[PDB]
Design an enzyme around this catalytic site. Structure first.
Site, PDB file in Angstrom:
ATOM      1  N   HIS B  84      38.074  14.685 -19.875  1.00  0.00           N
ATOM      2  CA  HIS B  84      37.037  13.693 -20.104  1.00  0.00           C
ATOM      3  C   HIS B  84      36.767  13.509 -21.593  1.00  0.00           C
ATOM      4  CE1 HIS B  84      34.895  17.513 -20.138  1.00  0.00           C
ATOM      5  NE2 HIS B  84      33.871  16.915 -20.724  1.00  0.00           N
ATOM      6  N   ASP B  86      33.447  12.935 -23.799  1.00  0.00           N
ATOM      7  CA  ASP B  86      32.033  13.189 -23.550  1.00  0.00           C
ATOM      8  C   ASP B  86      31.239  11.891 -23.452  1.00  0.00           C
ATOM      9  OD1 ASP B  86      31.917  15.884 -23.150  1.00  0.00           O
ATOM     10  OD2 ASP B  86      31.255  16.393 -25.193  1.00  0.00           O
ATOM     11  N   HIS B 244      38.663  16.391 -23.711  1.00  0.00           N
ATOM     12  CA  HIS B 244      38.694  17.841 -23.641  1.00  0.00           C
ATOM     13  C   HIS B 244      38.507  18.285 -22.197  1.00  0.00           C
ATOM     14  CE1 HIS B 244      34.441  16.809 -24.535  1.00  0.00           C
ATOM     15  NE2 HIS B 244      34.184  17.732 -23.625  1.00  0.00           N
ATOM     16  N   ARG B 259      25.671  23.976 -28.981  1.00  0.00           N
ATOM     17  CA  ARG B 259      26.360  22.775 -29.427  1.00  0.00           C
ATOM     18  C   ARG B 259      25.392  21.856 -30.151  1.00  0.00           C
TER      19      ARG B 259
HETATM   20 MG   LIG Z   1      32.539  17.926 -22.303  1.00  0.00          MG
END
Ligand SMILES: [Mg+2]
Ligand SMILES: [Mg+2]
Lengths: 273, 268
Positions: B84, B86, B244, B259
């Site tokens: 995917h 993000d 990723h 993150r």
């Molecule tokens: Mg992700």
């Protein structure tokens, strides 16, 4: 010796191990063999060994494949550099008796590029959904050198190659001969199922075709699931040992034309059941 | 600084680099930015930093997504183990992310990225012609909302209507073309034209078959890199050019990440 898994599914590095010592140390070899069966593929760094030692270590797993091919030390094949190895495959499953496995050493190569990946096809089988396991339990399928390596040859060379190696039929669900584990045993070499078209599976024609091919695509694509995979980066005198019965591998072709030198010793396998 | 690519396609490790220092060294940040754009994802080991330093480094890329230390999100421990990009289901999906591992298990939980610029460029010419003007929708309803109670799924859909994006995205900072479909993408919205559709089966399953071929490009190992986390390891990636995949090979265990996500603009 230190065993360091690379992922939870497949692969481990052996540390404090000189493969040369396993030639004559029966206890050390026994443990390496046990680890190979559990982790599917074993990796070692800095294996400064001779070709006789490379050959003699591989011979501890069984007789070596000694077809002359294009590689001074019988059993050893030099690979100096082709877009056939960058595919999810189990080595020479197009043979009646595909090899047991391989001991592969990197001699020289580029600092970046040319990784090799392996996939755990025991896990790929185990995690299939129940209705797929029931559907594939008795399936058999053919693995063709004609349609892979022979495909680009002049038609006469392709057909001669086919006569030399007729498309081998193998169980789709293979029982590993030393562990009893079930292996999902279809890969890039597999062309089609031979015994799919039964009243249990086929109501109307489209159930058989494309239906059979769609199931095969679903199965061979299981090797592309990262959960089942490990990726290894080569260095000089790095070595991979893998169980070809339980795995597929993929030689990544991300690199431009360069000089890379590998040497492998393949081990004879038996008839898949 | 030493830049060590992990593959020929994607990823590089930065050595002799402390991200905390990059907040104030403009020359250093320019290089970090340049390397990120060239290598799609950057990796660093042994980043012993505070949350303030993590956020301040990430803000150098742009404003942070702000849906105790604003901008930072703590993640303590099955949608991320999919190829995917993000939040491509947003009208303006994020620019990228700075991801730090706090602690975790010694094996398992690798993350992989795929270079979707290379995935575009190696497509066959007839595929490039076919998809040049395609647009497609990316849905949170059909992914995150799918298992919810039907009422919560529709409310979630109401908050974030399925976003239409070009299938071929122009990277805003490099000019590169990006194959911009992934696991969130449900279907093409403008495929059914007389140039592509003679009879019904050309449109359906035909359109869906092309989409599957496109999203499956991310599964090509040639386009991939796989990273094994260590404590205080850091990944920075350009979310516009990559997809990723968080590998979910591990049994139930405790893993702690932090993150900092960076705001992106409208894909064109
Ligand atoms: Mg992700
Ligand atoms: Mg091979």
């Amino acid at each position: 010796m230190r065993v360091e898994p690379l992922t939870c599914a497949i692969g481990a590095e052996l540390l404090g191990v000189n493969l040369a010592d396993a030639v004559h140390d029966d206890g050390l070899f026994a443990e390496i063999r046990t680890q190979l069966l559990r982790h599917r593929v074993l990796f070692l760094r800095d294996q400064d060994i001779t070709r006789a030692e490379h050959v003699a270590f591989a011979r501890r797993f069984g007789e070596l494949e000694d077809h002359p091919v294009a590689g001074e030390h019988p059993g050893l094949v030099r690979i100096y550099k082709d877009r056939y190895e960058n595919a999810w495959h189990s080595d020479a499953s197009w043979r009646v008796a595909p090899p047991f496995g391989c001991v592969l050493r990197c001699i020289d190569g580029p600092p970046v590029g040319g990784d090799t990946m392996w996939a755990n096809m025991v896990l790929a089988y185990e995690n299939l959904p129940d209705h797929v396991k029931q559907q594939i339990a008795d399936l058999r399928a053919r693995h063709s050198i004609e349609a892979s390596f022979g495909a680009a040859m002049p038609i006469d060379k392709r057909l001669a190659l086919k006569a030399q190696y007729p498309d081998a039929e193998h169980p789709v669900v293979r029982t590993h001969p030393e562990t009893g584990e079930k292996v999902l045993y279809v890969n890039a070499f597999t062309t089609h199922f031979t015994n799919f078209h039964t009243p249990a599976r086929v109501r109307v024609g489209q159930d058989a075709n494309p239906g059979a091919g769609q199931l095969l695509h679903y199965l061979i694509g299981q090797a592309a699931i990262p959960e089942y995979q490990v990726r290894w980066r080569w260095k000089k005198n790095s070595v991979a040992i893998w169980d070809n019965r339980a795995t597929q591998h993929y030689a990544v072709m991300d690199y431009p034309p360069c000089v890379r030198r590998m040497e492998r010793a393949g081990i004879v396998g038996d008839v898949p059941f």
